[PDB]
Design a binder for this molecule. Structure first.
Ligand SMILES: NC(=O)c1ccc[n+]([C@@H]2O[C@H](COP(=O)([O-])OP(=O)(O)OC[C@H]3O[C@@H](n4cnc5c(N)ncnc54)[C@H](OP(=O)(O)O)[C@@H]3O)[C@@H](O)[C@H]2O)c1
Ligand SMILES: NC(=O)c1ccc[n+]([C@@H]2O[C@H](COP(=O)([O-])OP(=O)(O)OC[C@H]3O[C@@H](n4cnc5c(N)ncnc54)[C@H](OP(=O)(O)O)[C@@H]3O)[C@@H](O)[C@H]2O)c1
Ligand SMILES: [Ca+2]
Ligand SMILES: [Ca+2]
Lengths: 413, 412
């Protein structure tokens, strides 16, 4: 089904469980009818990441860097329960963590605002953008079970060959756990750049959260890198733009974030950008109401995703042959932002107007009273929602399609 | 001033605004009523630096001895603090030191005021966070890396064989590295205390980890809780109409945001730290939260303010400007400490004194007398004016006025 021709190639990464089911329908009804789109397909379904030894994940990452745009459905990350469940050869790493490792950059997350959906948090008047650092820390770590007594040490061995630098971290008297993790100056700096630059262009303030009182040298490095770069390259233009940058302790930032009105960029270390960008997304209404875009330092490569998970409890219900009502908006906006970036790379204005148009139609369709259960909950009580207040997953997508077909037909005479 | 205590309470003095407030609470709401032995330790930054942080260690060991510890918020120094106080070094968190020595779980909970509107529209009931007090980020070894090399991790068995070595990372230019740990023993301890506490509340229990990413580290948290539920707690919980569940941290923070509450949330050191601030501020103020570190045996309580020393307000204070610093958390550290002092001494009268003061604080807030953070909760941020609240001193005084009437009012 072709209409708008797209020269560029979109690298699509398929995922798992309920999101995989919605992914198919989104392609089927919202994208392909309108777009003549070259798709380099990569199945990051869990079975296929097992079949290929996770190499499908690595190749997909590399294919995104080549073509410039990636669009990824939520995937399962496996632990022991999951290894059992699929008879996996191993506990494979988060495909997300692997993609992010290879690409680098920053994951910008923002709520998708629907005026008829009450925010959960009375104070939040404006959107918060989270710049989550995509590299290192707890997401590329080495952890270990300890089985008996013994001493946990770190050796740093320099390249020159000067002697080993060792630290006794802990004497274990019994079983326990240990782990090491890292970050790089180079990375933190790209993470500083893109955050400073995004807030400069939104004309908004920038907060950095760390726990540099505790991790004096580790988090300390982030604080100093951001402060050094601010003085050097952003203070003058920030002060001229009527905005400001400040380091705040993670403690104080979450309290501020909860009570403030929004209108600022909040830069988080990896883990905080993981946790808080869900607290935020649910605060604004639902996990399905959020964009998530991994951006290059150079602005040429974009991996757009849904930030939420595979919606396992909903899939278990879909698998019984029971009805589901799962919010597909975050999956759809993975596509639109990917296609928007695709069109920017190609000098293709038609593609950008389509991407924007699909975002308008989703938001407008929700705004006109047509919505999945989770948004109906935001409006009507937790226990005072009924079947007539919301559309199921299929209907919602169907309604969305009806509207998109109509809007597109009218759109560019 | 006294009237009411045999057993001893160990007092830990702190920094900045919480210090200023700590004094007033002792002056006006505690010592006037209680004749109590206090073992005083000054964890103000100057004395920590001056004693090479030994008063902190001494304070932690005093708490184990007499069984009750009451602690004011302290500074934990980074580089700017070292400059500011002319410190010998970037001393580690005194809280992190107290907890490393004492072990256990820090249980936190909002202090409900009916005239204070919640910021989260869905929260009908309290959320209780159970924070693992040990290990992980708060007893870790972190370094800056200045040039390329290899970050290895060695475990050297007691048995004397050979080291178990993992390559973590090949550095090319500069960075940071850290190493951190926890123990089966502490994690197990953390679980039992959460299971017992959610069992006695007849409330469900959630543990959150990121075991999909930290598969062995967080996996151990998840495996230990699960095995303990099966063996020791699943049957009793099912009889009580409650459950235990592990959720991924992503799932739990989203759930907590849309839940009505009424559950005990088991949090890893880092998560309990951060999510207890998000939860206190979601309920109305950082001022309106309790925080009680409990020992595995439950013979030893350290109570505190979970929030910081309120540096921005200390600075107003220093210039002679008017402050409205919420003192309720600092007050409830006294009351919960003493509650346990009374629990230990079988002092029926002291348990009730603590209970009464808590009653009077909230009851005073609910009669319209409050500090500026709580006025901002009722009126808007931009619509509060001076007449909606009391400054810090007046507020403590109003409570003080109020507490005397109340106490005098009781038994007679
Ligand atoms: N983007 C990614 O690649 C990504 C991110 C996170 C996790 N994961 C992986 O996916 C799985 C996550 O499962 P999880 O249950 O922990 O997290 P989850 O799949 O994000 O779902 C958690 C819950 O949040 C609500 N929710 C999330 N997305 C929703 C949507 N689109 N529409 C409606 N409700 C939604 C539902 O609550 P109710 O039950 O109340 O309806 C749902 O049960 C794990 O296997 C994990 O490895 C992947
Ligand atoms: N228990 C502890 O020992 C503990 C805990 C946390 C931090 N700290 C230490 O405290 C110092 C400063 O930390 P921080 O500035 O990150 O956080 P903070 O002192 O907790 O205060 C940060 C902000 O939260 C609000 N706030 C906190 N407590 C309040 C109260 N009792 N009444 C009214 N408002 C209150 C204020 O908001 P507004 O600005 O909006 O008025 C304040 O500016 C650091 O040295 C840190 O290491 C100690
Ligand atoms: Ca997340
Ligand atoms: Ca905290």
């Amino acid at each position: 089904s072709q209409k708008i021709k797209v020269a560029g190639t979109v690298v699509e990464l398929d995922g798992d469980e309920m999101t995989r089911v919605i992914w198919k329908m989104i392609k089927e009804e919202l994208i392909f009818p309108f777009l003549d789109v070259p798709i380099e397909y990569y199945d990051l379904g869990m079975e296929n990441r097992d079949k290929t030894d996770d190499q499908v994940t690595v190749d997909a990452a590399h294919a995104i860097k080549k073509h410039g745009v990636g669009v990824k459905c939520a995937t399962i990350t496996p632990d022991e329960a999951r290894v059992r469940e699929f008879n996996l050869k191993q506990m494979w790493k988060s495909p997300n963590g692997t993609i992010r490792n290879i690409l680098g950059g920053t994951v910008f997350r923002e709520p998708i605002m629907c005026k008829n959906v009450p925010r959960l948090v009375t104070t939040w008047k404006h959107p918060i953008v989270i710049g989550r650092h995509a590299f290192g820390d707890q997401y590329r770590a080495t952890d270990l079970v300890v089985n008996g007594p013994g001493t946990f040490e770190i050796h740093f061995v320099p390249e020159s060959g000067g002697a080993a630098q060792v630290q006794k971290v802990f004497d274990f008297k019994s079983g326990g756990v240990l782990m090491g993790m890292y970050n790089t100056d180079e990375s933190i700096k790209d993470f500083a750049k893109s955050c400073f630059e995004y807030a400069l262009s939104k004309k908004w303030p920038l907060y950095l959260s760390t726990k540099n009182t505790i991790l004096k040298r580790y988090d300390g490095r982030f604080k100093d890198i951001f402060a050094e770069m601010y003085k050097a390259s952003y203070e003058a233009d920030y002060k001229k733009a009527g905005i400001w940058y400040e380091h705040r302790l993670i403690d104080d930032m979450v309290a501020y974030a909860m009570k403030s009105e929004g209108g600022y960029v909040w830069a988080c270390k990896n883990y905080d950008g993981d946790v808080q960008s869900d607290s935020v997304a649910q605060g604004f209404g639902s996990l399905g109401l959020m964009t998530s875009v991994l951006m290059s330092p150079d602005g040429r490569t974009v991996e757009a995703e849904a930030a939420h998970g595979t919606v396992t409890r909903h899939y278990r219900q879909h698998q019984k042959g029971e009805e589901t009502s799962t919010n597909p908006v975050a999956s759809i906006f993975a596509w639109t932002r990917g296609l928007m970036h695709r069109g920017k790379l190609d000098q293709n204005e038609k593609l950008v107007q389509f991407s924007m148009l699909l975002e308008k139609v989703v938001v407008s369709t929700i705004e006109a009273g047509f919505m999945t259960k989770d948004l109906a909950i935001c409006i009507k009580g937790m226990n005072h929602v009924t079947r007539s207040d919301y559309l199921n997953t299929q209907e919602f997508i169907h309604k969305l399609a009806d509207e998109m077909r109509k809007a597109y037909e009218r759109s560019k005479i």
